[PDB]
Design a protein around this ligand. Structure first.
Ligand SMILES: *[C@@H](C)[C@H]1/C(=C/c2[nH]c(/C=C3N=C(/C=C4\NC(=O)C(CC)=C4C)C(C)=C\3CCC(=O)O)c(CCC(=O)O)c2C)NC(=O)[C@@H]1C
Lengths: 172, 162, 162, 172, 162, 172, 162, 172, 162, 172, 162, 172
């Protein structure tokens, strides 16, 4: 598992170099933008339950074949496993948001997940839909301009979207 | 790699939990201390050479037998001195890495792991590198909380060698 | 009990290590955030009653059947209303505890653990306490980073109930 | 495991009360005195190795019967176990210093340790001596007035001494 | 899937043993009880609709707020009532499955597993389905050992919801 | 674990004897009274949840000191542990009812339980109260004369009461 | 001790579950079969001697060397014949115990466990006891489901000896 | 693991349907034919040892290359492993007979067994021979018309043969 | 395969250690004893037949019923006698293997493993092979430390059969 | 695991034969040559540390790309893992020398090792170089004619070389 | 304590087995080698002093800085030289113990265990004791298999220090 | 675990002394008497089965109350456990004989065994009888003067008897 700083450090060690002024500037800028990051994490984490619930409801409304007898999300056990999966994906996403790097999401969540869903028979494309829903919702919540010190968070939201899209592409 | 952020994430994942306010106040100590940390890293990087030389000489004066004794482990040959300056540079660079990452992760994973086995196999005395690190700690020119960071990680190295 | 300090100590002890700069920048996010945390805890403690009443009424207006339906779980009897105000007070007090300790430890150990089994055994709907917590979050009167702490832990409770 | 804040919280929960103004003031004062604490921990931790080494050397100089054939600290295995024990004690002590409470030291170190040393035959009184040495050394290092913002740390040093004496009394 | 036969086989296989007279007297309680079981399953299957309607109305009369309150969980919209009748049908069908298999296996694996997580996520009150099950138990029209089977599995469901 | 038949068999083996006509008659009578037993088990098991719930409510109404701050049943964790304990006791009781012998209740539930409650600080006398409540309720439910073939079950109910009282005495 | 009832209870306790209809249909095969079981047990107990003698002689005629060969394991001495009749009585009594308990528990725990080690240590041939058991099975005089029980457990013994 | 009833239940749940009169009739007929099934199981199980022994003897008489030095069944260890294998196959077969379904035989015995024998070098065709022997013997024993209430068991014996042939085909 | 050398190697590898003087003094007992061992192996190999016949007859005279009783396990048919001589040859050959390898490995892995299950399945009495082994031990014609080796491994077999 | 004697025994058992005079002569000759073998093992084992150290130094002198930043043997952890690997190879080699057979080296060291180095990215050709160095050194040490009873050990040294080359070929 | 006999016993007990010929040929390498072993132990014990002095001087001449450098680890004070002679005596005595016990057990348990931690904590260089051991190996005056034993265990020590 | 040599070594290390001429002489004498020891072990081990069997038969002949219904050695399971116990005792005894020291017998067999038999209810005095039988038999077998190089083994037999008596006293 790596964070942004650890990533730069590892890349520099592979070459056996001290950090250059450019890298010091970049990391310093990352630090200066830490409050926005902590805000995003705090918000998405604070609304995780409603994100997963609303995303699931919307999914099953759009694809009722998943929740009818014979579907993959039929019975309470498989429904619970689906809601659980969504919680996991959102969780490791938030991990990546705090870390500034997708290393933890990849290794501990996305690596080998396409194979799992193929073996079980779960349609990874539906999971991708779910991840898209949770993405839009989470970005809305994190970029809600009410009750916070105004400013520009456009670069952070594109990164969060980067992690979500990364997951969706990983499962689909 | 051990960092405040990775320690927080690992803490929340070890128990299948989302992040909480706890982990965020941790990452907050990180971001806040990152100013002094970054200052010390910049300063050490800027004066790395003058100081690897100050330090290599500290070692050679403290342990003169290492510049006269016959052996591939000693700095009695140009290749030996080259290896020594190399290793001192490794220690300093590791310190800068720790200062950049906000934790001991880099030094733990790139250096400390396997240090005893190496020093034993190649007949390298820890006291040499302890002396070099003491010199660097004494002459890095830092004041205030930057010196606290630099000294924190240097002393971490010394304790690893003790 | 989960706190930033206990999380740091547990992290260092899990691997037989002394403390390091990492854990100290964590405890530093703690101490620094303790100002906003303490402010929110003081404010919530000072206006606890007016608000347990605001909140109990929020619940009774949102779910009127709980003030008319026959059952020991509902607030259709004086004893029922007493139990309800009691429980809302428990939630608020737990929030203040979390704000004082700088983490979710108190709420995790004194409340969340066994919550599902209790709500199921005694036929208590989570939605009731979610409504109370939404009211408290809306009318605690806090601004800035104090409101961020209070809302952080209240929302933590709601997520536990969802 | 508890810290000061967790301790007050637990005591208040046992009575079912909100914190009073006195307690809020006390904890706020603890916070205001956190920099000194972090300094003490940083220093003792930074000199742990020399503390343990010098304390051991002094011990064996004062009690040579421990390091002669038949002694408890004879052979490298038992010597290593003694140095190790000292490292452990100092470590949990530092834990307690950071936590502001002796809970972790007690449970994870001192609880049941007198029984262990009695069963093994190790003289707990010698261990107590060692702990006293490490105490004096650690307090000297932590209260060294050089290279730090001047101020009064007398209350903190009495607490650290409290933890050390607690350990010594626990083993003796 | 838990059944008397599968429980016997699993019992004999867990210890690397052939079957014995024990397991066969077990499967014999099964085959003998299969007459009452089958009767109850047939009767419940034949009068499933009239009764899902009796029952849905039992729920709506006991908890009228579920037919007027705004929310996707409540039966205040045609889609809500549809979902509710659907779920009651699921419970009844599960009962018939248990009666056919001679055990709780079907209900355990298709329904009970994950029930708490679902009811919590979607804000569905157990009391609703408990009321429906009480109605079905009261008006299934069975007498004798058939009623004993039906009531056994229905009560099993209620206990799962309590 | 033993049932009635296994009990007689073991007692006969200890003496190295074949069963006598008296024992064959006794066991045959046990068999002839099996339907009533299965009824009792089915009923108590069918109403386990309401038995435990009502018994708990009554207990805490009679002893409010258990559910106030500082009490043993305060907080949701300890409440859940109490309800759980009650479920366990009732469960092993039903086991004994089906088996016609208290062997399983003793070994797997009652043996060593008084020591546990003493160590934890739980008042075993309150647990005894709970067990009495569950006893009265369970006997009422099992001996309810409605919706069943009439007959005399007085001997069975005294046995069930025997198991309950056995548990209560074991914890108090 | 393995019986239908103890197997059911153990099945329900292994997963922290109350009893269910499954286990009760098992105990029901038990109680129902208890009539034939009890009949066979009574009959075998009543004619135990005549038959231990029929059987001991079956063994001595099938393997005559056991009545003439020198050795403490053989029945060439009065003490040997006494031990043999004793053991045949043990097998028969175990069968009756299994019939009374409704399972193999008694024979498993009192006899089968350690049988190989004993027969090997004391130079006792299984074929002897197999012959005795074949005789008992052939001349116990039972008809119908009683003979099915007796033969079930006797054959269980033979398989244990094979 | 499934039995006949569980199989029908699962097939009906996949479609989200209640059972039809045809299925109720079929399962009722299965019940009415349970005594014959219990008889078959009781008999084969009662003669398992002689089935395995005679089948093995016949096999090695027909294929002496298995029991000569270098053969797969040479040495007591490999012989014991072969007799063991036969016991296992017959055992899971009887399981399937009691269950009315081949699910347990497949998953817990036959699934992946052809790969095992190929890796070890055991000739699966010889195992198939053994299974055929045990089949003929077991059917003879179970359909022996002596000492049992007369009737027609032809449908059951074809099912038992179905399980045996299933195993043989699975290994060969 | 258990031998002094493999036992030494396994001992050193079980703890991630190089070999030491200990293991070498072990392998030294092996090499030194290899003279007597080899002598006994040669002698037994040279007189294997005369002796398998001496021994088979020892068995047939001690247990005459094995040459007259009807059964595929007994030596009442030419095929039976063939199987018996075969098995006695197996035991002798195993002894020679143990003598060549300097340990019980060969006999453990090729014979003893699964012996009880075989003797039980095929109704083979250990006493027969014990008698054969006693004969071989009595008439192998060896003196001194060669006889000590041969008798050591033969007695090992007998103990395995007891 | 096999030694020479065990190897001959197994080969003879596969054919079901007693040993022939030729085999007895061969094994007897092996015995007569045991002192030389024990000498070789004792010497190589006695100088293991200097063999591994000198071989490593020579390797890194010949291939400095391994010990520069980015190299496979960079950092102390990977260096330690390399020295460790060399110790392991030399160790199992000595095992094979004592056993007179390569069975233990193969199974417990060489089997599957080429796959490991390919997955990790370690250049197996460099490992081969190391093994060659350790080979030359070990043979020099074991065949040093000083301080030992003179004689011809040429056949043993070709066997030792056989094991070393076997390892090198196995990794390269 | 690791010895040939204890290694054999441990080997037989690890698998619940009696002793066998294998273990006895091991103990036989032990007893046979005990003559050379004992000779070397006697000789080393008889000339222990002259040689601890030869050796201490070997160290002081090879590493002269240890007789002039300021530090409690160096032999620049009478107490330092005393500690050094003490430790060399410990190594020699351990060698004699290994020679008496026929294995490395004594040295493993009394010395090697914890050696790295000690040398690191007290800043003691292995090279010093390696030099002392090289001197002892060069000047112990032994010839033949006695020298092979002494050198075997001394070299064992050196490898432990490398 | 210790042998004679290890015992002397440990005693000398506790005092920090080199061995004296007396000790060297004693151990040398132990070595010179090793063939007799190996003989004793080989013989007792070779007749272990008949020792245990005959001893058991004699025991049960002398104390028939052990093998009648209700006795401790009744049923095959407990009989097997008794024969097993005897095998264990004899085995660790032989271990001690080979080692020349009772350390392994004590720790791995006798330590805590009196408590076990008291808890289980086994009469330790009967076990003692068994051990005496096995003692007499084993000494007869080991000191049988037929088929061995004549000599005086009286000192060894008193040691073996010492181990047996040690066990008997330990259990009784
Ligand atoms: C076909 C296999 C052969 C056959 C069988 C057969 N039996 C009956 C009658 C009965 N079979 C049993 C057996 C059991 N019932 C149980 O619960 C148990 C487990 C303990 C067993 C072993 C019983 C009890 C009966 C009824 C009593 C009786 O003896 O009649 C039939 C008749 C049909 C039926 O189901 O009753 C048949 C056909 N008879 C043959 O000739 C076939 C070779």
């Amino acid at each position: 598992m790596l964070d942004a700083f650890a990533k730069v450090v590892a890349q520099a060690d592979a070459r056996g170099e001290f950090l250059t002024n450019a890298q010091f500037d970049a990391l310093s800028n990352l630090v200066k933008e830490g409050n926005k990051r902590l805000d995003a994490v705090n918000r998405i984490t604070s609304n995780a339950s409603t994100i997963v619930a609303n995303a699931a409801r919307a999914l099953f409304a759009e694809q009722p074949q998943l929740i009818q007898p014979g579907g993959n999300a039929y019975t309470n056990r498989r429904m619970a496993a689906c809601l659980r999966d969504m919680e996991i994906i959102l969780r490791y996403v938030t991990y990546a948001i705090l870390a500034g790097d997708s290393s933890v999401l990849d290794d501990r969540c996305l690596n080998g997940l396409r194979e799992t869903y193929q073996a079980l028979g779960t349609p990874g494309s539906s999971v991708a839909v779910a991840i898209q829903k949770m993405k839009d919702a989470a970005i809305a919540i994190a970029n809600d301009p009410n009750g916070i010190t105004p400013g520009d968070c456009s670069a952070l939201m594109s990164e969060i979207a980067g992690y979500f899209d990364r997951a969706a592409a990983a499962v689909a | 790699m051990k960092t405040p952020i990775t320690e927080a994430i690992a803490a929340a994942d070890t128990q299948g939990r989302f992040l909480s306010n706890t982990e965020l106040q941790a990452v907050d100590g990180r971001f806040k201390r990152a100013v002094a940390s970054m200052e010390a890293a910049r300063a050490l990087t800027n004066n790395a050479q003058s100081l690897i030389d100050g330090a290599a000489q500290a070692v050679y004066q403290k342990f003169p037998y290492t510049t006269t004794m016959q052996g591939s482990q000693y700095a009695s040959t140009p290749e030996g001195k080259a290896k020594c300056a190399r290793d001192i540079g490794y220690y300093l660079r590791m310190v800068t890495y720790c200062l950049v990452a906000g934790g001991t992760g880099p030094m733990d994973e790139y250096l400390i792991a396997g240090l005893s086995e190496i020093n034993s196999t190649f007949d390298l005395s820890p006291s040499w590198y302890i002396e070099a690190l003491k010199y660097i700690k004494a002459n890095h020119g830092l004041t205030g909380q930057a010196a606290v960071e630099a000294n924190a990680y240097i002393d971490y190295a010394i304790n690893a060698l003790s």
